[PDB]
């Protein structure tokens, strides 16, 4: 959750470090600027099935200079961060 926010924050920050618009990004990874936006503001709750959310993350990260693993790791801390927050 907070870790998701920091997730999308790294994505946003790393994309902008280049002449890359959301819409350019979506053309190179067949994502949808809509979905990428959400990812960047850290809002993943119902974006899609978990299996597919973890694949956008992989794909985005591979498209930017990012470490896919350090990014999925965050996504997963993020999940346990809502988990722990339940009961």
């Amino acid at each position: 959750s907070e870790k998701w926010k920091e997730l999308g924050e790294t994505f946003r920050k790393k994309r902008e470090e280049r002449r890359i618009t959301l819409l350019d990004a979506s053309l190179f990874t067949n994502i949808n600027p809509s979905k990428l936006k959400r990812i960047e503001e850290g809002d993943l709750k119902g974006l899609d099935a978990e299996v597919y959310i973890k694949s956008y993350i992989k794909r985005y990260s591979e498209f930017l200079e990012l470490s896919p693993d350090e990014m999925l790791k965050l996504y997963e801390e993020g999940k346990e961060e809502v988990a722990e927050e339940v009961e």
Binding site: T29, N30, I31, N32, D48, A49, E50, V51, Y52, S55, R59
Partner: protein
């Protein structure tokens, strides 16, 4: 009745999912009978074992020849074995059983498995095509109207299915998938060195250094295996490099690719757009070839997702499904 189980009958290992527990069974799909009487001796792992100790006093029977059931009496017996190891022993109720079937299957082949299961001990049995079970086991929403594409490569058959609205809309099944991989390794070894290796070794070579994509990394994977020199009858020992092996494996896999590509083409465009966005879900024990994901991508242009649990997905689905009444009430029944 009391416990609910999903079975993924495979031509390699059978997996049994128990609800409330998990995969409670992963044992090889083999019965060992004595080479003389025809006395069914052991089933499962107990049979993989004594087949390696005493192969000369035993006939090994693998009930699922290709995709479906050949030796129905042997099946019956195997079936009865797994439902029982899964049941628990301390359990004494007939369980509810959902078994995974291949997509292209005649009702006759269907009637059979339903019966077998019922005899094997199930109080009630359902069927479900292996891919729908997989999709359900990974938590894709198959009820949703967005296209999904699963590619289940087993050992017997590679299946390519488009799911949309709790249903399959397009599919392809072909008989090349992992045993044809092992097979290519054996042949390669035979024809380049004059050495004979066999099933279990083929399978381990495939695991340690198999690949279908070039790269400094894959080319320096090595392994050593032992076989018999076909010229001297003597035991040799080779060291195989991931890079000699790739040539052979690619040939085999080209045909799985073609199957995926051939599917996308006859897919309804609206769903293709969803699949190009989400990716192809690559699952199954057959699928664990280094670079297979990468090769599929390069060759169809859609991204490829690997299941986090490639071996247990169908079973978990076959069990997951006994809650999903809306998808349940659609499955063929007996009991």
């Amino acid at each position: 009745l009391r416990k609910d189980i999903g079975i993924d009958l495979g031509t390699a290992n059978t997996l049994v999912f128990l609800r409330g527990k998990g995969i409670v069974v992963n044992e090889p799909s083999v019965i060992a009978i004595d080479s003389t009487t025809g006395e069914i001796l052991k089933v499962g792992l107990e049979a993989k074992n004594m087949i390696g100790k005493t192969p000369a006093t035993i006939k090994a029977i693998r009930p699922m020849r290709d995709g479906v059931i050949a030796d129905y009496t042997v099946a019956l017996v195997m079936l009865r074995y797994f439902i029982n190891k899964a049941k628990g022993g301390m359990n004494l109720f007939k369980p509810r059983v959902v078994i995974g079937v291949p997509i292209g299957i005649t009702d006759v082949e269907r009637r059979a498995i339903l019966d077998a299961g019922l005899e094997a001990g199930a109080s009630k049995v359902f069927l479900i095509e292996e891919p729908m079970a997989a999709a359900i086991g990974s938590n894709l929403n198959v009820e949703e109207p967005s296209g999904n594409m699963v590619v289940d490569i087993g050992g017997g058959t590679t299946e390519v299915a488009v799911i949309s609205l709790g249903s399959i809309v397009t599919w392809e099944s072909i008989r090349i998938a992992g045993d044809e991989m092992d097979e290519a390794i054996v042949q390669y070894v035979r024809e380049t060195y004059r050495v004979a290796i066999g099933e279990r070794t083929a399978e381990r070579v495939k695991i340690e250094i198999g690949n279908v994509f070039p790269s400094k990394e894959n080319d320096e994977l090595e392994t050593t295996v032992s076989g018999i020199d076909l010229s001297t009858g003597l035991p040799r020992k080779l060291t195989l490099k991931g890079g000699e092996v790739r040539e052979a494996l690619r040939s085999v896999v080209v045909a799985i690719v073609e199957s995926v590509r051939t599917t996308l083409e006859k897919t309804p465009p609206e769903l293709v757009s969803d699949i190009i966005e989400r990716g192809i879900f690559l699952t199954g024990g057959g699928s664990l070839l280094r670079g297979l994901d990468t090769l599929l991508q390069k060759e169809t242009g859609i991204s490829v997702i690997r299941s986090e649990e490639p071996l247990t997905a169908v079973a978990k689905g076959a069990g997951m499904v006994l809650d999903k009444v809306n998808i349940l009430k659609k499955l063929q029944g007996a009991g």
